[PDB]
Structure 1
Amino acid sequence: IRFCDSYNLPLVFVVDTPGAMPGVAEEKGGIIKRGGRFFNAIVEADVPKVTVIIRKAYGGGYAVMGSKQLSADLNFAWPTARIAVIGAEGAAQLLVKRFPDPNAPEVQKIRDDFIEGYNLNMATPWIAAERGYIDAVIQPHETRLLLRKSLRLLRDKQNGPKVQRKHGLLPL
């Protein structure tokens, strides 16, 4: 991203991710700072930023992959997109851990019902579209020509207001 920004290439983000990796090996590997640098580079860059979401956009994956809240210019989703803080299985684990172990199959049945309701409601394009976090939900075939139209509009983007200074500091 920093290279493309330095040479003025527009950025296209194609999003399909559960977000950051879990685990102690990735924590000790530095995932907090490396993600922080990815977030930094995406906000730093001044070039046109256009995003297409395919299926999953959970948590930090949604945020970092050119979210509108992180200054992306135009954001589109395919109707398969799922934009949420966490996927249904993860929310189901946080729900069910408030119950005892699933020795009674009522627990399994509650998980299955919750996961279907969640995949019908929270984990959909439609809340982000209703709130305007994404600008449109598009038929997949529109994507190529809609990218042409969008980047023709954005060709002369001037990023601001930004305060000139020696440099922006970066997580190191």
Structure 2
Amino acid sequence: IRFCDSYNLPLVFVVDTPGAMPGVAEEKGGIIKRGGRFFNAIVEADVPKVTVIIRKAYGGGYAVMGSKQLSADLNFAWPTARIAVIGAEGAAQLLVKRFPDPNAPEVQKIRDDFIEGYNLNMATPWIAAERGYIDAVIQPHETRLLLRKSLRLLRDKQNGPKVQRKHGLLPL
């Protein structure tokens, strides 16, 4: 990102991620600070920023992969997109499943029904579209010509308001 910004390359984000990889080796390796750097770089960059969400984009993955927050300029999703804080499996395994003590076939079907509801009402682009967090839901074949039109519009983007300074500061 920072290289592309310093040489004025527009940034195109193609998103398909569950977000950060949960684990101890990641935490001990600094995933928080590296992600903070990624958060910072994508907002420092002044170039045209366009995003195409393909299927899942959860949590910090949604954030850092050129959300409209963090000031991406145009946001498109394919109809397969899934925008949420967490996937259906994680939401069920976290809130719902831990109330039963047993892994009974009760909890099995209650969980499967929760997944079924969440993959429709929650992990779908329609909430984000209703709220205008993404700018359009597009048929995939549109993408090439739509990127051409979008970057043609954004070609002369002047970013601001920004206050000039010696430099920004970056989690380092």
TM over 0.5: yes
The farther-off stretch of 50-59 and 98-107 is 98-107
Contact 2:97-2:111 at 8 Å conserved across structures: no
> Aligned pair in 2 of structure 1 residues 32, 103: CA closer, same or farther (>3 Å)?
closer
Contact 1:102-1:108 at 8 Å conserved across structures: no
Could you give the per-residue CA deviations for residues 45-95 of structure 1, whole angstroms, max 9, x where no partner exists? Answer: 000000000001000000000000110000000000000000000001112
- 1-structure distance, mates of 2:149, 2:58: 28
The farther-off stretch of 121-130 and 90-99 is 90-99
Could you give the per-residue CA deviations for residues 118-158 of structure 1, whole angstroms, max 9, x where no partner exists? Answer: 00110001000000000000000000000000000000000
Give every structure 1 segment of 4 or more consecutive aligned residues whose post-TM-superposition deviation is greater than 3 Å. Answer: none
- Cα-Cα RMSD: 0.8
The farther-off stretch of 88-97 and 137-146 is 88-97
Could you give the per-residue CA deviations for residues 20-39 of structure 1, whole angstroms, max 9, x where no partner exists? Answer: 11100000100000000000
- 1-structure distance, mates of 2:155, 2:27: 39
> Aligned pair in 2 of structure 1 residues 98, 151: CA closer, same or farther (>3 Å)?
same
TM-score when normalising by structure 1: 0.98
Task: Measure how far apart 1:96 and its partner are.
Answer: 3.1
Contact 2:10-2:47 at 8 Å conserved across structures: yes
> Aligned pair in 2 of structure 1 residues 103, 68: CA closer, same or farther (>3 Å)?
closer
Q: Where do 1:10-29 residues align within 5 Å?
A: 10-29=10-29
Q: Where do 1:28-67 residues align within 5 Å?
A: 28-67=28-67
Task: Give the aligned length.
Answer: 172
The residue aligned with 2:145 is 145
- 2-structure distance, mates of 1:56, 1:103: 27
**1:168 counterpart = 2:141:** no
TM-score when normalising by structure 2: 0.98
- 2-structure distance, mates of 1:103, 1:147: 48
Gaps in structure 2 of 5+ consecutive residues = none
Task: Measure how far apart 1:97 and its partner are.
Answer: 4.2
- 2-structure distance, mates of 1:82, 1:134: 12
Gaps in structure 1 of 5+ consecutive residues = none
Contact 2:97-2:107 at 8 Å conserved across structures: no
